[PDB]
Amino acid sequence: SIDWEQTFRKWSKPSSETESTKAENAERMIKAAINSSQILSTKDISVFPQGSYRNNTNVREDSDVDICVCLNTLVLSDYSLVPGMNASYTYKQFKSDLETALKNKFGTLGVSRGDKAFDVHANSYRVDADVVPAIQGRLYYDKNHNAFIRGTCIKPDSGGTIYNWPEQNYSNGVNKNKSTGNRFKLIVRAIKRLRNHLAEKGYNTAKPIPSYLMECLVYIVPDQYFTGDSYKTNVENCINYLYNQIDSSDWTEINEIKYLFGSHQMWNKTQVKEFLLTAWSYIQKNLEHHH
Ligand SMILES: O=c1ccn([C@@H]2O[C@H](COP(=O)(O)OP(=O)(O)OP(=O)(O)O)[C@@H](O)[C@H]2O)c(=O)[nH]1
Ligand SMILES: [Mg+2]
Ligand SMILES: [Mg+2]
C-alpha cells in the first residue's frame, strides 16, 4: 500500500540542494587540469557540463558530474542525409594528452580510462566526474557549407563514432519544462527514482533501462499529459502513452536529431515495453494477478 502521490512528489526532488555547487566544482577543476597542461592550454578547447547535473534531472547524490572536454578545431561531419555529399593533431593524441593532464592534476590514483570517458574520483578536490574527450561534430542537411547542425563527436577506444547533441538536449529540456510549468523534469526525476527502486528490488526489466533513455522517453510524452495536480496521474499518463505508441513510433532523442532506437543504441523497444509493463503493475494497489 504505497501512497504513490506522496511517493512521486518526494521522488521528484533533486538529488540534493547543492547540485549546482558540485557541478560548478567539477567544471572548474577540469578546466584547471586543462590550463595546467602545456600542450592542451594552447588548443581551442571547450569544457562544459552535460548530463543530468546540467539538465537538472539528477536524482542520485553519488552520480558523477558529466563533463565534456571538446577540441573544437577537429571536425567530424555526417553527410549521410545529402545525396552525393562527401590534421596533424589526432583525436587519439588529444585523448592521451587529456589523460596525462588529468593524472597530473588529480594523481594517477584518481583517474581511470574507460572506452569512452575518464573516471575522475579525487577526494582532495572533492571531484567525481565522467570526463569525455570530444571533437566538433556536424550533421549536414543540405549541400551548402552553412547547412549543418553542430554537436559533439566521441571516438571510443574500441572503434566507431558517436554523435552527441548536448546543447540541443539542454535547450529542448528547458523549453519543455517551461511549457509544462516545471512538471516535465519533476516527472523525469520521479520516474528515474522509480526505475532505481525497481532495479534495487531485483526487477530485471529495470536493469537495462538507463537514465538518459528515460529522460528521452518522458520528453516524448505530449505536454497535455503533465497537467493537473496529481503526479501519480502524470506518471501513469507517461507509461500509458509510451506503451501504446512505441510500436509504430519513429521517435528521436530529446535533441530531436538522433533516432531513439536503432543499431546505434544499446537499448531496444522490447526492453522499454517490458519495463513499462513492470512499472505499470508495480504502481497499482491490490493487484491479484501476475504474469
Ligand atoms: O547512451 C547514451 C548515454 C549517455 N549519453 C549522453 O551522455 C550524458 C551523460 O551520460 P549519463 O549516463 O551520466 O546520463 P545522465 O547524466 O543523463 O543520467 P544520470 O547520471 O543521472 O544517471 C547523457 O545525459 C547523454 O547526454 C548518450 O547520448 N547516450
Ligand atoms: Mg550523468
Ligand atoms: Mg556519467
Superfamily of the domain at 18-168: Beta Polymerase, domain 2 (3.30.460.10)
Q: Which ligand is closest in space to the CA of residue 134? A: 1
- Cell 587519439: give the residue: 92
Cβ(151) to ligand 1 under 6 A? no
Please give the distance, rounded to the nearest whole angstrom, from the Cα atom of residue 259 to the centre of ligand 2.
Answer: 20
Q: Is 192 annotated as a binding residue?
A: yes
Q: How was this structure determined?
A: X-ray
CA 66, 71, 76, 81 torsion-angle sign: positive
What would the 3-class secondary structure string for the chain be? CCCHHHHHHHHCCCCCCCHHHHHHHHHHHHHHHHHCCCCHHHCCEEEEEEHHHHHCCCCCCCCCEEEEEEEEEEEEEECCCCCCCCCCCCHHHHHHHHHHHHHHHHCHHHEEECCCCEEEEECCCCEEEEEEEEEEEEEECCCCCCCEEEEEEECCCCCCCEEECHHHHHHHHHHHHHHCCCHHHHHHHHHHHHHHHHHHCCCHHHCCCCHHHHHHHHHHCCHHHHCCCCHHHHHHHHHHHHHHHCCCCCCECCCCCCECCCCCCCCCHHHHHHHHHHHHHHCCCCCCCCC
38 is in an annotated binding site: no
CA–CA dist 200, 31 (Å, integer):
35
Q: How far apart are CA 10 and CA 186, in angstroms?
A: 10
**Nearby residues of 4 by Cβ (< 8 Å), 6 or more positions away:** 232, 235, 283
Would the annotation count 130 as a binding residue?
yes
Model resolution, angstroms = 2.0
What is d(CA 239, CA 250) in angstroms, rounded to the nearest whole number? 17
CA-nearest residue, atom 2 of ligand 1 = 212
